[PDB]
Amino acid sequence: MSQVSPTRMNLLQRRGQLRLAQKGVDLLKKKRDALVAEFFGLVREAMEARKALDQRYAEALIRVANTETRLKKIGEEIKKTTRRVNALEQVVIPGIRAQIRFIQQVLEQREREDTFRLKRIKGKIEARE
Protein backbone atom coordinates (compact mmCIF):
# COMPACT_ATOMS: atom_id res chain seq x y z
CA MET A 1 0.00 0.00 0.00
CA SER A 2 1.26 3.48 0.90
CA GLN A 3 0.08 6.52 2.83
CA VAL A 4 -3.17 6.22 4.80
CA SER A 5 -1.69 2.69 6.49
CA PRO A 6 0.51 5.29 7.92
CA THR A 7 -1.33 6.67 10.75
CA ARG A 8 -4.23 4.25 11.64
CA MET A 9 -1.20 1.75 11.91
CA ASN A 10 0.43 2.78 14.64
CA LEU A 11 -2.37 4.36 16.73
CA LEU A 12 -3.90 0.60 16.56
CA GLN A 13 -0.51 0.09 17.88
CA ARG A 14 0.13 3.16 20.49
CA ARG A 15 -3.51 4.17 21.75
CA GLY A 16 -4.46 0.36 21.65
CA GLN A 17 -1.20 -0.46 24.09
CA LEU A 18 -1.61 2.56 26.23
CA ARG A 19 -5.06 0.41 27.38
CA LEU A 20 -3.45 -3.13 27.25
CA ALA A 21 -0.79 -1.46 29.87
CA GLN A 22 -3.68 -0.08 31.93
CA LYS A 23 -5.42 -3.85 32.20
CA GLY A 24 -1.84 -4.78 33.61
CA VAL A 25 -2.14 -2.34 36.78
CA ASP A 26 -5.74 -3.14 37.01
CA LEU A 27 -4.78 -6.93 37.75
CA LEU A 28 -1.90 -6.36 40.23
CA LYS A 29 -4.56 -4.20 42.22
CA LYS A 30 -6.83 -7.51 42.03
CA LYS A 31 -3.10 -9.10 43.29
CA ARG A 32 -2.91 -7.52 46.56
CA ASP A 33 -7.20 -8.15 46.83
CA ALA A 34 -6.94 -11.73 46.03
CA LEU A 35 -3.73 -12.75 47.93
CA VAL A 36 -5.16 -11.07 51.31
CA ALA A 37 -8.53 -13.22 51.03
CA GLU A 38 -5.78 -16.14 50.27
CA PHE A 39 -3.98 -16.53 53.66
CA PHE A 40 -7.00 -15.79 55.96
CA GLY A 41 -8.94 -18.64 54.28
CA LEU A 42 -5.87 -20.42 54.96
CA VAL A 43 -6.30 -19.27 58.74
CA ARG A 44 -9.32 -20.85 60.25
CA GLU A 45 -8.58 -23.79 57.94
CA ALA A 46 -5.45 -24.96 59.56
CA MET A 47 -7.88 -24.25 62.43
CA GLU A 48 -10.36 -25.96 64.42
CA ALA A 49 -9.58 -28.89 61.59
CA ARG A 50 -7.53 -30.54 63.56
CA LYS A 51 -10.19 -29.42 66.27
CA ALA A 52 -11.59 -32.58 64.11
CA LEU A 53 -8.37 -34.81 65.18
CA ASP A 54 -8.82 -34.98 68.93
CA GLN A 55 -12.49 -35.55 68.17
CA ARG A 56 -20.22 -33.08 67.70
CA TYR A 57 -16.65 -32.76 68.20
CA ALA A 58 -18.04 -34.10 64.50
CA GLU A 59 -18.15 -30.29 63.42
CA ALA A 60 -14.92 -28.88 65.29
CA LEU A 61 -14.76 -30.71 61.96
CA ILE A 62 -17.49 -29.59 59.55
CA ARG A 63 -18.10 -26.69 61.40
CA VAL A 64 -14.17 -26.50 60.71
CA ALA A 65 -14.27 -26.94 56.78
CA ASN A 66 -17.79 -25.52 56.33
CA THR A 67 -15.39 -22.42 57.32
CA GLU A 68 -12.25 -23.84 56.56
CA THR A 69 -13.43 -25.54 53.16
CA ARG A 70 -15.78 -22.74 52.05
CA LEU A 71 -13.30 -19.81 52.69
CA LYS A 72 -10.47 -21.76 50.71
CA LYS A 73 -13.03 -23.08 48.37
CA ILE A 74 -13.78 -19.33 46.97
CA GLY A 75 -10.42 -18.06 47.81
CA GLU A 76 -8.36 -21.31 47.31
CA GLU A 77 -9.50 -22.25 43.62
CA ILE A 78 -12.20 -19.89 42.42
CA LYS A 79 -9.63 -16.95 43.79
CA LYS A 80 -6.90 -18.03 41.44
CA THR A 81 -7.14 -20.40 38.26
CA THR A 82 -9.05 -17.01 37.89
CA ARG A 83 -6.32 -14.64 39.47
CA ARG A 84 -3.36 -16.34 37.90
CA VAL A 85 -6.15 -16.01 35.10
CA ASN A 86 -6.41 -12.23 34.88
CA ALA A 87 -2.80 -11.51 34.87
CA LEU A 88 -1.34 -15.02 32.78
CA GLU A 89 -3.68 -13.58 29.92
CA GLN A 90 -3.49 -10.05 29.36
CA VAL A 91 0.43 -10.32 29.45
CA VAL A 92 0.90 -12.86 26.25
CA ILE A 93 -1.27 -9.81 25.02
CA PRO A 94 1.52 -6.99 25.48
CA GLY A 95 3.44 -9.89 23.57
CA ILE A 96 0.84 -8.66 20.57
CA ARG A 97 1.98 -5.11 20.76
CA ALA A 98 5.52 -6.45 21.39
CA GLN A 99 7.22 -8.45 18.90
CA ILE A 100 4.20 -7.72 16.52
CA ARG A 101 5.39 -4.01 16.91
CA PHE A 102 8.66 -4.90 15.42
CA ILE A 103 6.06 -5.74 12.77
CA GLN A 104 4.68 -2.31 12.09
CA GLN A 105 8.24 -0.61 12.02
CA VAL A 106 10.00 -3.07 9.18
CA LEU A 107 6.62 -2.62 7.37
CA GLU A 108 6.81 1.53 7.81
CA GLN A 109 10.77 1.22 7.35
CA ARG A 110 10.08 -0.46 3.97
CA GLU A 111 8.42 2.37 2.46
CA ARG A 112 8.03 6.38 3.67
CA GLU A 113 11.84 5.82 2.97
CA ASP A 114 11.42 3.51 -0.17
CA THR A 115 8.46 5.68 -1.51
CA PHE A 116 10.97 8.56 -1.40
CA ARG A 117 14.17 6.94 -3.64
CA LEU A 118 11.29 7.00 -5.97
CA LYS A 119 9.29 10.85 -5.93
CA ARG A 120 12.57 11.86 -6.41
CA ILE A 121 13.77 9.13 -9.44
CA LYS A 122 10.98 10.23 -11.76
CA GLY A 123 11.99 14.04 -10.87
CA LYS A 124 15.24 12.79 -11.82
CA ILE A 125 14.05 11.66 -15.48
CA GLU A 126 13.05 15.10 -16.64
CA ALA A 127 14.39 16.61 -13.78
CA ARG A 128 17.79 15.30 -15.69
CA GLU A 129 16.48 15.74 -19.38
Binding site: L11, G16, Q17, R19, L20, K23, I93, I96, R97
Partner: protein, 143 residues
Protein backbone atom coordinates in the same frame (compact mmCIF):
# COMPACT_ATOMS: atom_id res chain seq x y z
CA UNK B 1 -29.59 23.44 5.22
CA UNK B 2 -30.56 22.51 8.79
CA UNK B 3 -33.26 25.32 8.95
CA UNK B 4 -35.02 24.01 5.81
CA UNK B 5 -35.31 20.61 7.51
CA UNK B 6 -36.31 22.10 10.85
CA UNK B 7 -39.07 24.25 9.32
CA UNK B 8 -40.39 21.88 6.64
CA UNK B 9 -39.60 18.33 7.88
CA UNK B 10 -38.62 18.07 11.55
CA UNK B 11 -37.55 20.40 14.31
CA UNK B 12 -34.93 17.86 15.49
CA UNK B 13 -33.20 17.07 12.16
CA UNK B 14 -29.74 18.54 13.12
CA UNK B 15 -29.70 17.18 16.67
CA UNK B 16 -30.68 13.73 15.36
CA UNK B 17 -27.95 13.53 12.72
CA UNK B 18 -25.33 14.86 15.17
CA UNK B 19 -26.40 12.17 17.67
CA UNK B 20 -26.23 9.41 15.04
CA UNK B 21 -22.82 10.60 13.87
CA UNK B 22 -21.52 10.63 17.46
CA UNK B 23 -22.81 7.03 17.66
CA UNK B 24 -20.92 6.06 14.51
CA UNK B 25 -17.88 8.01 15.75
CA UNK B 26 -17.93 6.11 19.06
CA UNK B 27 -18.34 2.77 17.24
CA UNK B 28 -15.23 3.53 15.14
CA UNK B 29 -13.16 4.17 18.30
CA UNK B 30 -14.54 1.03 20.00
CA UNK B 31 -13.78 -1.18 17.00
CA UNK B 32 -10.17 0.08 16.93
CA UNK B 33 -9.67 -0.94 20.58
CA UNK B 34 -11.46 -4.29 20.09
CA UNK B 35 -9.03 -4.91 17.21
CA UNK B 36 -6.34 -4.91 19.94
CA UNK B 37 -7.72 -6.30 23.22
CA UNK B 38 -10.59 -8.36 21.79
CA UNK B 39 -14.34 -7.96 22.55
CA UNK B 40 -14.56 -10.21 25.67
CA UNK B 41 -13.75 -7.41 28.18
CA UNK B 42 -16.51 -5.15 26.73
CA UNK B 43 -18.98 -3.83 29.30
CA UNK B 44 -22.73 -4.04 28.61
CA UNK B 45 -22.77 -0.26 27.97
CA UNK B 46 -20.17 -0.64 25.17
CA UNK B 47 -21.93 -3.69 23.72
CA UNK B 48 -25.15 -1.68 23.54
CA UNK B 49 -23.43 1.13 21.65
CA UNK B 50 -22.11 -1.40 19.08
CA UNK B 51 -25.59 -2.98 18.88
CA UNK B 52 -27.29 0.37 18.09
CA UNK B 53 -24.32 1.53 15.96
CA UNK B 54 -24.82 -1.61 13.84
CA UNK B 55 -28.57 -0.91 13.50
CA UNK B 56 -27.71 2.61 12.21
CA UNK B 57 -25.38 1.13 9.60
CA UNK B 58 -27.73 -1.66 8.49
CA UNK B 59 -31.13 0.02 8.94
CA UNK B 60 -30.23 3.59 7.96
CA UNK B 61 -26.88 4.07 6.14
CA UNK B 62 -27.47 1.08 3.89
CA UNK B 63 -30.10 1.69 1.21
CA UNK B 64 -31.18 -0.64 -1.59
CA UNK B 65 -31.04 1.15 -4.95
CA UNK B 66 -32.62 -1.96 -6.57
CA UNK B 67 -35.75 -2.07 -4.34
CA UNK B 68 -38.84 -0.38 -5.79
CA UNK B 69 -39.39 1.39 -2.43
CA UNK B 70 -35.97 1.95 -0.83
CA UNK B 71 -34.60 3.23 -4.18
CA UNK B 72 -35.80 6.66 -2.98
CA UNK B 73 -36.33 7.76 0.63
CA UNK B 74 -38.51 10.87 1.01
CA UNK B 75 -37.43 13.49 3.58
CA UNK B 76 -40.45 12.66 5.74
CA UNK B 77 -39.44 8.97 5.80
CA UNK B 78 -35.75 9.74 6.55
CA UNK B 79 -36.47 11.57 9.83
CA UNK B 80 -39.12 9.04 10.93
CA UNK B 81 -36.63 6.17 10.52
CA UNK B 82 -34.04 8.25 12.38
CA UNK B 83 -36.32 8.81 15.32
CA UNK B 84 -37.12 5.04 15.51
CA UNK B 85 -33.42 4.28 15.70
CA UNK B 86 -32.57 7.10 18.15
CA UNK B 87 -35.56 6.20 20.31
CA UNK B 88 -34.39 2.56 20.37
CA UNK B 89 -30.96 3.89 21.45
CA UNK B 90 -32.31 5.93 24.39
CA UNK B 91 -34.47 2.98 25.48
CA UNK B 92 -31.50 0.62 25.09
CA UNK B 93 -29.20 2.77 27.29
CA UNK B 94 -32.07 3.28 29.76
CA UNK B 95 -32.74 -0.47 30.02
CA UNK B 96 -29.03 -1.27 30.55
CA UNK B 97 -28.85 1.40 33.27
CA UNK B 98 -31.60 -0.64 34.99
CA UNK B 99 -29.65 -3.93 34.68
CA UNK B 100 -31.57 -5.31 31.66
CA UNK B 101 -29.39 -7.90 29.90
CA UNK B 102 -28.20 -6.61 26.53
CA UNK B 103 -28.86 -10.13 25.17
CA UNK B 104 -32.52 -9.52 26.07
CA UNK B 105 -32.54 -6.24 24.07
CA UNK B 106 -30.57 -7.72 21.15
CA UNK B 107 -33.37 -10.25 20.50
CA UNK B 108 -36.16 -7.74 21.08
CA UNK B 109 -38.93 -8.52 18.51
CA UNK B 110 -39.24 -4.88 17.26
CA UNK B 111 -35.59 -5.01 16.07
CA UNK B 112 -36.42 -7.20 13.09
CA UNK B 113 -39.18 -4.72 12.11
CA UNK B 114 -36.75 -1.78 12.44
CA UNK B 115 -34.48 -3.74 10.06
CA UNK B 116 -37.19 -3.89 7.35
CA UNK B 117 -38.45 -0.33 7.96
CA UNK B 118 -36.57 0.98 4.87
CA UNK B 119 -38.88 -1.29 2.79
CA UNK B 120 -42.15 0.14 4.23
CA UNK B 121 -43.75 2.88 2.09
CA UNK B 122 -46.22 3.89 4.82
CA UNK B 123 -45.81 5.67 8.15
CA UNK B 124 -46.49 2.43 9.90
CA UNK B 125 -42.73 3.21 10.54
CA UNK B 126 -43.38 5.94 13.34
CA UNK B 127 -45.77 3.42 14.94
CA UNK B 128 -42.58 1.42 15.71
CA UNK B 129 -41.69 4.03 18.34
CA UNK B 130 -44.69 3.11 20.48
CA UNK B 131 -44.11 -0.57 19.62
CA UNK B 132 -40.52 -0.11 20.87
CA UNK B 133 -41.54 1.57 24.16
CA UNK B 134 -44.16 -1.05 25.14
CA UNK B 135 -41.74 -3.86 24.24
CA UNK B 136 -39.09 -2.36 26.54
CA UNK B 137 -41.82 -2.15 29.22
CA UNK B 138 -42.38 -5.92 28.74
CA UNK B 139 -38.61 -6.05 29.48
CA UNK B 140 -39.05 -3.71 32.50
CA UNK B 141 -41.79 -6.13 33.62
CA UNK B 142 -39.74 -9.35 33.41
CA UNK B 143 -36.87 -7.20 34.81
Amino acid sequence: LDPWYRENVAEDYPELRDAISELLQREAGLQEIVQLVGPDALQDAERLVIEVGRIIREDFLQQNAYHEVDAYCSMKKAYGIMKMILAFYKEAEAAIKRGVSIDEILQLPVLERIGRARYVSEEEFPAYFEEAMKEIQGAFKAL
